[PDB]
Amino acid sequence: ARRTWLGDILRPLNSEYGKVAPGWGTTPLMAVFMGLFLVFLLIILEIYNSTLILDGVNVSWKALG
Amino acid sequence: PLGISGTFNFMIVFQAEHNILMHPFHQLGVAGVFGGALFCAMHGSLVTSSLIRETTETESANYGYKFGQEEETYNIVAAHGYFGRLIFQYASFNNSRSLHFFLAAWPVVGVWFTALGISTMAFNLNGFNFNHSVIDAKGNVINTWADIINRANLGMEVMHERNAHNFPLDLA
Amino acid sequence: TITPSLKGFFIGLLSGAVVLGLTFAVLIAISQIDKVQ
Amino acid sequence: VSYPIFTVRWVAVHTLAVPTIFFLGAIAAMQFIQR
Amino acid sequence: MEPNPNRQPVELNRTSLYLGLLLILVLALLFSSYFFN
Amino acid sequence: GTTGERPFSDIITSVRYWVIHSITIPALFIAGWLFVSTGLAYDVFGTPRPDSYYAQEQRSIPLVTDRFEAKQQVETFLEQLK
Amino acid sequence: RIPLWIVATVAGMGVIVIVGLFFYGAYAGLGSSL
Amino acid sequence: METITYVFIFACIIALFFFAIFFREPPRITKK
Amino acid sequence: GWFDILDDWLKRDRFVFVGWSGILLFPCAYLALGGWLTGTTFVTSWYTHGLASSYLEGCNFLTVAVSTPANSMGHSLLLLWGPEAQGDFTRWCQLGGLWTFIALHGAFGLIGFMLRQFEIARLVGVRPYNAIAFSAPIAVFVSVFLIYPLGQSSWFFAPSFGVAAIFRFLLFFQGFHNWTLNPFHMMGVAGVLGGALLCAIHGATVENTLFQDGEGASTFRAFNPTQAEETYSMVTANRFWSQIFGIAFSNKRWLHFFMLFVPVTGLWMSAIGVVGLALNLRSYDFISQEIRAAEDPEFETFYTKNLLLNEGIRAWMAPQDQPHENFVFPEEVLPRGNAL
Amino acid sequence: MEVNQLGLIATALFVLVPSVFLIILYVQTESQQK
Amino acid sequence: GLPWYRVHTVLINDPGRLIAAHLMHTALVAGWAGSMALYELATFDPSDPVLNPMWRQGMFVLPFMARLGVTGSWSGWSITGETGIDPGFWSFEGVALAHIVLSGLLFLAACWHWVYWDLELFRDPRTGEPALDLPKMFGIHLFLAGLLCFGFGAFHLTGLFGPGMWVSDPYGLTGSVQPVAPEWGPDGFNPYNPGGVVAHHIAAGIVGIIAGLFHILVRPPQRLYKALRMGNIETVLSSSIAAVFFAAFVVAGTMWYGSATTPIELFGPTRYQWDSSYFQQEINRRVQASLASGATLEEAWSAIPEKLAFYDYIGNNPAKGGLFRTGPMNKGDGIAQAWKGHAVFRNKEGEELFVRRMPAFFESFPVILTDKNGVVKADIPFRRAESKYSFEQQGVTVSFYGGELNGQTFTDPPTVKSYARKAIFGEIFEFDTETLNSDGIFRTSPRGWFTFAHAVFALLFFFGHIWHGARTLFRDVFSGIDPELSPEQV
Amino acid sequence: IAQLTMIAMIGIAGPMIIFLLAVRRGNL
Ligand code: CLA
Ligand code: CLA
Ligand code: CLA
Ligand code: CLA
Ligand SMILES: C=Cc1c(C)c2cc3nc(c4c5[nH]c(cc6nc(cc1[nH]2)C(C)=C6CC)c(C)c5C(=O)[C@@H]4C(=O)OC)[C@@H](CCC(=O)OC/C=C(\C)CCC[C@H](C)CCC[C@H](C)CCCC(C)C)[C@@H]3C
Ligand SMILES: CC1=C(/C=C/C(C)=C/C=C/C(C)=C/C=C/C=C(C)/C=C/C=C(C)/C=C/C2=C(C)CCCC2(C)C)C(C)(C)CCC1
Ligand SMILES: CC1=C(/C=C/C(C)=C/C=C/C(C)=C/C=C/C=C(C)/C=C/C=C(C)/C=C/C2=C(C)CCCC2(C)C)C(C)(C)CCC1
Numbered sequence A: 001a002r003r004t005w006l007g008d009i010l011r012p013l014n015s016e017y018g019k020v021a022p023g024w025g026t027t028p029l030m031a032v033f034m035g036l037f038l039v040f041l042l043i044i045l046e047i048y049n050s051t052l053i054l055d056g057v058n059v060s061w062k063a064l065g
Numbered sequence B: 001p002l003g004i005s006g007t008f009n010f011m012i013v014f015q016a017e018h019n020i021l022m023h024p025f026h027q028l029g030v031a032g033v034f035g036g037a038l039f040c041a042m043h044g045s046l047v048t049s050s051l052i053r054e055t056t057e058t059e060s061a062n063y064g065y066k067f068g069q070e071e072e073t074y075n076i077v078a079a080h081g082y083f084g085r086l087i088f089q090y091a092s093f094n095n096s097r098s099l100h101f102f103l104a105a106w107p108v109v110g111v112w113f114t115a116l117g118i119s120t121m122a123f124n125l126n127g128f129n130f131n132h133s134v135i136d137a138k139g140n141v142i143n144t145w146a147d148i149i150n151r152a153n154l155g156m157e158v159m160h161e162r163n164a165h166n167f168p169l170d171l172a
Numbered sequence C: 001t002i003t004p005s006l007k008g009f010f011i012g013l014l015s016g017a018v019v020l021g022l023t024f025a026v027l028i029a030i031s032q033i034d035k036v037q
Numbered sequence D: 001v002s003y004p005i006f007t008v009r010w011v012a013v014h015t016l017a018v019p020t021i022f023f024l025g026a027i028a029a030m031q032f033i034q035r
Numbered sequence E: 001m002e003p004n005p006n007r008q009p010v011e012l013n014r015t016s017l018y019l020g021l022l023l024i025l026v027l028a029l030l031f032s033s034y035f036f037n
Numbered sequence F: 001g002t003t004g005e006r007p008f009s010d011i012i013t014s015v016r017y018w019v020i021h022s023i024t025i026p027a028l029f030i031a032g033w034l035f036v037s038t039g040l041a042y043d044v045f046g047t048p049r050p051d052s053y054y055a056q057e058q059r060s061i062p063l064v065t066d067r068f069e070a071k072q073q074v075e076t077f078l079e080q081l082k
Numbered sequence G: 001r002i003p004l005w006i007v008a009t010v011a012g013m014g015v016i017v018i019v020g021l022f023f024y025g026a027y028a029g030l031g032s033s034l
Numbered sequence H: 001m002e003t004i005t006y007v008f009i010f011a012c013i014i015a016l017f018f019f020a021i022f023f024r025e026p027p028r029i030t031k032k
Numbered sequence I: 001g002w003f004d005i006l007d008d009w010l011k012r013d014r015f016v017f018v019g020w021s022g023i024l025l026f027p028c029a030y031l032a033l034g035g036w037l038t039g040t041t042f043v044t045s046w047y048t049h050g051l052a053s054s055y056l057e058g059c060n061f062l063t064v065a066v067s068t069p070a071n072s073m074g075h076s077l078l079l080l081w082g083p084e085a086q087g088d089f090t091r092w093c094q095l096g097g098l099w100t101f102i103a104l105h106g107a108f109g110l111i112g113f114m115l116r117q118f119e120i121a122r123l124v125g126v127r128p129y130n131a132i133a134f135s136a137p138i139a140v141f142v143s144v145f146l147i148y149p150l151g152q153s154s155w156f157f158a159p160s161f162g163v164a165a166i167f168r169f170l171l172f173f174q175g176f177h178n179w180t181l182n183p184f185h186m187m188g189v190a191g192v193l194g195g196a197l198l199c200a201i202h203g204a205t206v207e208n209t210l211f212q213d214g215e216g217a218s219t220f221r222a223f224n225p226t227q228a229e230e231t232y233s234m235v236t237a238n239r240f241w242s243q244i245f246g247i248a249f250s251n252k253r254w255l256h257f258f259m260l261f262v263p264v265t266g267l268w269m270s271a272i273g274v275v276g277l278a279l280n281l282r283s284y285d286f287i288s289q290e291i292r293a294a295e296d297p298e299f300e301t302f303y304t305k306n307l308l309l310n311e312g313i314r315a316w317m318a319p320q321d322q323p324h325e326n327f328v329f330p331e332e333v334l335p336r337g338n339a340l
Numbered sequence J: 001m002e003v004n005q006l007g008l009i010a011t012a013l014f015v016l017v018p019s020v021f022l023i024i025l026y027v028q029t030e031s032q033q034k
Numbered sequence K: 001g002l003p004w005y006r007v008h009t010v011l012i013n014d015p016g017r018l019i020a021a022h023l024m025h026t027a028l029v030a031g032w033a034g035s036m037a038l039y040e041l042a043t044f045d046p047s048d049p050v051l052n053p054m055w056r057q058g059m060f061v062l063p064f065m066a067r068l069g070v071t072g073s074w075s076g077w078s079i080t081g082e083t084g085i086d087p088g089f090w091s092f093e094g095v096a097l098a099h100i101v102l103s104g105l106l107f108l109a110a111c112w113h114w115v116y117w118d119l120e121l122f123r124d125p126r127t128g129e130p131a132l133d134l135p136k137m138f139g140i141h142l143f144l145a146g147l148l149c150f151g152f153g154a155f156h157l158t159g160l161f162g163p164g165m166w167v168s169d170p171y172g173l174t175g176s177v178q179p180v181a182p183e184w185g186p187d188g189f190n191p192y193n194p195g196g197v198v199a200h201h202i203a204a205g206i207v208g209i210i211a212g213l214f215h216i217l218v219r220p221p222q223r224l225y226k227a228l229r230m231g232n233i234e235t236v237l238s239s240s241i242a243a244v245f246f247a248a249f250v251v252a253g254t255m256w257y258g259s260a261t262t263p264i265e266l267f268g269p270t271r272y273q274w275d276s277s278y279f280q281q282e283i284n285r286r287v288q289a290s291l292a293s294g295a296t297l298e299e300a301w302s303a304i305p306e307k308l309a310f311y312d313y314i315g316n317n318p319a320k321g322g323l324f325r326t327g328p329m330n331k332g333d334g335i336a337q338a339w340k341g342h343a344v345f346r347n348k349e350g351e352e353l354f355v356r357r358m359p360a361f362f363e364s365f366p367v368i369l370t371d372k373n374g375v376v377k378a379d380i381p382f383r384r385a386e387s388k389y390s391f392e393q394q395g396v397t398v399s400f401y402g403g404e405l406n407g408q409t410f411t412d413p414p415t416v417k418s419y420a421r422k423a424i425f426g427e428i429f430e431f432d433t434e435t436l437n438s439d440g441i442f443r444t445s446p447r448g449w450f451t452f453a454h455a456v457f458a459l460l461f462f463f464g465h466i467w468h469g470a471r472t473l474f475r476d477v478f479s480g481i482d483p484e485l486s487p488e489q490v
Numbered sequence L: 001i002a003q004l005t006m007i008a009m010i011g012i013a014g015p016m017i018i019f020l021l022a023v024r025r026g027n028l
């Protein structure tokens, strides 16, 4: 090894290696934002594809100036 | 012709004069070729993926084989085990000999037909001609993709050999 | 606000969840009816 | 052995088996439509 | 400095050389026409 | 070499099987047949009957020309007795 | 028990019949040319 | 200039061919 | 926990392995196959391409197909309940909703299936080279049925699902993109053609280089399902080819990896070529050739010849192949040689 | 004729560079003791 | 030893030399950027932003520098076409300068991290052997990203403490660098509204800052750490690549279809604008308006700004071109010099005819002329043997309004047909073919190339993901398999 | 009109001349 000023100061940030939460930890909470993101994309996708029209949002070079 | 583009010429014109894509023999041909490449990949992968470990983590997995071996270099039982589960057991080979016969039989048989196709359309027994088959209640002609194919063929017919024809029918 | 195509989006977003539902319902159920070891 | 009836294999087999015959029946009928 | 212990030797057999070159050359025979366009 | 399922061979041979399917199979068949023969299929799929591609005189095609008012446009095509 | 070889030759002819009906339909149906 | 380039590569592939057939690594049995 | 119980059930070894993947595969895979079989026999392509496309109309197994949507639709996903069909089913059918249905569904179905290979591989404990390989067919489907038309004006120019309906896709590409002259398509075929060779050649090399392990003529039974010795003389095979072709394998591990490589690489290349045809960035012409053909009227190569075949294909097809363009090409404007 | 000026050098380096690569390896492999 | 295609595995767990490597790469990518810049500056012509803008000169990097502010040269000129402007230090030269240096430094840095590879920071106190706590790393990095993402939208795009971004009207005639105000409403999800690009970076930036912290604190649920073989760097790769190619397929789509991010005055028109006759309609709309306010045909068309007419030319359609048709769009049809003017075709009866335009799909297309109702009135025949509509038999003539040929009329068949043959591509222009020694064969715009390149790389990267991912979930069975014979019995 | 009548019989004939043998069990 070879410690160094910067090296020590950063020593903490990299040390908790294999440290894991137990069981199904935060998984379920995660599986929700995940599903939320999935729906969020489908929306912005379907908006760009003009499948989901929304007065106020005009997906053309127009609506510009 | 003996050349790259010269071959495409042979093809494009052939199609126009014989409508080969619409001939059973050519289709069997592509089944054999597509299939071959397909199977070639199947075998190739199944086998390569079920090789008995005898190599290091940082050593070519190939070295695990010596020219002039007695026993096999892959688990044909593990191979069959995986492939049998992908589709379903009885739809998978376990007999290396039956596997390899199929492996050879398929392409060779298919190409045999493709060769018989060109040898057959060499006497003007061409592909199916479904031009203006489906017609409506009054007699109008209702097009099918078979017709869109005929137009593309006419373009080829009408333009190949610009100056070689002097008469109506292309009998040569 | 809530335009015809917006309503349809919900109809499909709802008609979709249902399918995922009945599917995981049925599955989670039959799964828990046999698997002894 | 004491084999069961309604199984997963059965379901599949029917999802393809049932419609098929229904189509073969449909098509067989078309052979008579005209103009 | 300490002789880094993560290094292994590199190898390319004769057959690989050949298979390699066969590939380079033919690709070159295939793309040169389009390079000169 | 085995799993729970009752070996097809046995089933395709069981007189019970045929006793069931001699009824079921032709059942499904006659159904689909009627599906076509009763003209129902034509309406389930908006597919034209031999006498519904064009109006008597017209020789033009009912080509859908714009996405959003498409359904509406299609309906009108059925109008000219097409 | 219904002998297999019979299940086959029966289900077999049965297919040549339906598939043959299709081939006939080709010179009469709408897929005709007449 | 182009002709030369096409023929050269060709000439190179044929050379390869030669060496590959006549100067391969003799294929050794068992004790490899 | 129910999860591990849900798992337990799924990964249970049945006749037709389900697995987690199946939750995606089977729903889709069946819908794709189903939609095709449905349209092939019931739905028409009249309001879409002015074409009869189903058995119900008179089409046979070759002429039938699930045709693409109108060009008006553009790249619309055409959902059953979207602005187009508006929840209505029959309309959906007539607007070619069944295309994006089969397309998009089958698409997920190829994802599920590859995942399956990956999942089953893991369980059975074998290497996933069957999955790597299957990337090739995904690429083809993805680039051709999705990426391509995504670069064009709309789904209308994607290949329609059907036998003949695919041949026109071929003829089109020749005529408009002069696709046969593309370096990538060539590699493509070199691989598929070359792959169907390894297949045949390796198969025969094995069957005619077998050891005798039985007393019968039909040597099929003479096989040990339970490993042990090599069933064919790898040593004899080597000497055969080494004397008839000059080159010959001698490392079954490589000979088999090669067989994965050749056709998977081929299809990957053929894909890139198409990903380029999306933007119309084709390999249509050779400029040096065109320039000499302009100034000098006696210069003729099998290349120039071909380009004329293309002109004819485009001029005589465009009309009924691109209805939305209301093309009208007077007889006098139609390119044609003498007499024909 | 009327070709591309860089075509020659594009083809030359396309062949040389990777060939030179392989060759460097093969020879350094080939000369490894034992 | 190691096969040629594995030589880089020598880093799989040498955090030191892995950083040394990653440093060198960044150096080359930064280096490339700097010098690709200088190459464009040594060949780009600012003499005319109207008819010879960067996207006609095969400029690829120059546009990405304008989209964010840099629009001037230390030599005095500027992208918009103004003079006397003082870009300050951050001129194209400046940007190019900067990267070249950042590259030199990253180089030196790569060297140091290579020699001093065994820093203790990479060794786990516990096992005393090399190790990197990925989960915490990801949290840290993700924190910095959102922190920077935030700033970019918050200060740069808004103008608070920065230039802004490229913004233009609906027909790329006014474009420039302007401060853009956020937009959290719904229309901010509209690809064509700049406000959305601002809101996004502020919101996503924050969400990014929050989420980072989370990951800096909360640890990975055992279940996952196990499933996604975390603590195995070769999996960080499989996921990143999956993201990188996702990002790629998206940028390729917004470049081809257009968005406030790929502005036409910087990347060129869209194949879709030509398809829907986008600019053709904006012109007419304008011309008919002038006629209403009692102007003459000459006056009406003369009012039409050259720049506008130029977008209505199939020679700027990215869908025309070829894979080996190299160079700028200028090596094709030539450097655009001026607008010859609107061409109106008429036949003996005075009837006004119209030239059927060329669909992008067609390399070559026929000259056909129809009236308002679409009736074929005239054309240029192949076989003259029985031509009914030759320009000769119809007395077709052509007149021009506004532009070089304004007020002139031509009646000698050949000349009329020449122009008719040109009308096919839309507005007729005057090119300088000498200079670049052009060949007259259409080439694609940067918009087109960027799109082709990214759509390929993306599709290629998919394969990398599938490969590396697999190699992570099957590390154990790598090298081969072993024993037992279990298969058909649960 | 419907000589399908023919085929039918000469058709079940082939399988018959082996079936009767499956009954009289012998020489197959
Ligand atoms: C599980 C496998 C599966 C998958 C992946 C798909 C996938 C798809 N289907 Mg198919 N389908 C399936 C099974 C499946 N299907 C089955 C079994 C049937 C027979 C019943 C069908 C019948 C079917 C039809 C009839 C149609 C499709 C269509 C489609 C496509 C788009 C539909 C869509 O927008 O969904 C959106 C996705 C969702 C609803 C998922 C939401 C998930 C989150 C976690 C739930 C949150 C819900 C909550 C209410 C929201 C809170 C937010 C709040 C702000 C309101 C899509 C490719 C359409 C198509 O092909 O178009 C061309 C179409 O018309 N499918
Ligand atoms: C000191 C900082 C720095 C700065 C201010 C610039 C500034 C600039 N660069 Mg340089 N660059 C740098 C470092 C820097 N660079 C380094 C270190 C390299 C080597 C890797 C490069 C390599 C480089 C290249 C190759 C190019 C530039 C270009 C440019 C110019 C255009 C900017 C642009 O459009 O980016 C576009 C930015 C993106 C790619 C978007 C980032 C978003 C990604 C997709 C998200 C990543 C996912 C993230 C982790 C998810 C979590 C986020 C959370 C908030 C949700 C601009 C003048 C361009 C140019 O014009 O050349 C001169 C160009 O082509 N740069
Ligand atoms: C990928 C990103 C990228 C993109 C989109 C562009 C885009 C562009 N460049 Mg830039 N360029 C780049 C990277 C990029 N460049 C890099 C890294 C360099 C440094 C070398 C340059 C150096 C450069 C120069 C010096 C010039 C340009 C020019 C141009 C413009 C003209 C287009 C062209 O020449 O196409 C040409 C495209 C091709 C020939 C196609 C490449 C495809 C090859 C043949 C396939 C290789 C296949 C492979 C062998 C297959 C084997 C596989 C098998 C074994 C499995 C265009 C805007 C020109 C300009 O200034 O415009 C006026 C110009 O003079 N560029
Ligand atoms: C995101 C970046 C990325 C990174 C960091 C890695 C990293 C790695 N790859 Mg992966 N890979 C990627 C993308 C990436 N890959 C993609 C997109 C694909 C699909 C095409 C692959 C396919 C792949 C395979 C098939 C293999 C690896 C292997 C490896 C490992 C060893 C590398 C090596 O020694 O190469 C050796 C390098 C060379 C001497 C040859 C380089 C020659 C190229 C083809 C010529 C073109 C070079 C040119 C400069 C490239 C410009 C870059 C362009 C993207 C802009 C290494 C961990 C190997 C492995 O797993 O080891 C056991 C392995 O077998 N990779
Ligand atoms: C066109 C010819 C061609 C076909 C038809 C084909 C077919 C198939 N290849 C498979 C596998 C493979 N193919 C492989 C390599 C190759 N395959 C090739 C060429 C082909 N491969 C080539 C050239 C290669 C070499 C690169 C590999 C390595 C594998 C496998 O591992 C796999 C296998 O299991 O081997 C036997 C099977 C996957 C089944 C499946 O995913 O079910 C589930 C998904 C379904 C049912 C969805 C289908 C959805 C598609 C996208 C829509 C099709 C639409 C209609 C249903 C079809 C009718 C349309 C036509 C008339 C045009 C399938 C039988
Ligand atoms: C679409 C859809 C759906 C559904 C549906 C389905 C799922 C269906 C299915 C279907 C199916 C699943 C079908 C099938 C059919 C089939 C058929 C019709 C077949 C036929 C066949 C034949 C005819 C054969 C023959 C042969 C061969 C191939 C080979 C050789 C020999 C022989 C001759 C035997 C839903 C509601 C969700 C929604 C909307 C859409
Ligand atoms: C055509 C072109 C191009 C190209 C490029 C190239 C070809 C490049 C190259 C490059 C190179 C080729 C580089 C190099 C580099 C180098 C370096 C980076 C170095 C460094 C060094 C150092 C650091 C040193 C040191 C020292 C000394 C020696 C002395 C004493 C002192 C000192 C210490 C300082 C581009 C892309 C741009 C664009 C387009 C065009």
Ligand SMILES: CC1=C(/C=C/C(C)=C/C=C/C(C)=C/C=C/C=C(C)/C=C/C=C(C)/C=C/C2=C(C)CCCC2(C)C)C(C)(C)CCC1
Pocket (backbone or CB within 6 Å): K028, K029, K031, K032, K035, K100, K101, K103, K104, K105, K107, K108
């Ligand atoms: C050290 C130092 C320095 C310096 C530095 C320098 C001067 C640098 C440079 C650098 C550079 C100057 C760089 C460059 C780079 C480049 C690159 C890195 C490139 C690349 C390329 C590529 C990769 C390509 C490819 C390709 C081809 C060939 C064709 C086909 C397509 C593609 C695109 C793929 C100073 C004084 C500041 C100070 C401090 C120290």
Ligand SMILES: CC1=C(/C=C/C(C)=C/C=C/C(C)=C/C=C/C=C(C)/C=C/C=C(C)/C=C/C2=C(C)CCCC2(C)C)C(C)(C)CCC1
Pocket (backbone or CB within 6 Å): G005, G008, G009, G010, G011, G012, G013, G014, L010, L011, L012, L013, L014, L015
């Ligand atoms: C898929 C399959 C199968 C099937 C088969 C079948 C379905 C068959 C059929 C068959 C049949 C169905 C046959 C028939 C036969 C017949 C015969 C061999 C006949 C003969 C005849 C004669 C010789 C006659 C005569 C006559 C008459 C009748 C009347 C008039 C006069 C005269 C005298 C001429 C099997 C199981 C193998 C196994 C594998 C699979």
Ligand SMILES: [Cl-]
Pocket (backbone or CB within 6 Å): B009, B013, B159, B160, B161, B162, I305
């Ligand atoms: Cl010819």
Ligand SMILES: [Fe+2]
Pocket (backbone or CB within 6 Å): B043, B047, B100, I202
């Ligand atoms: Fe084999």
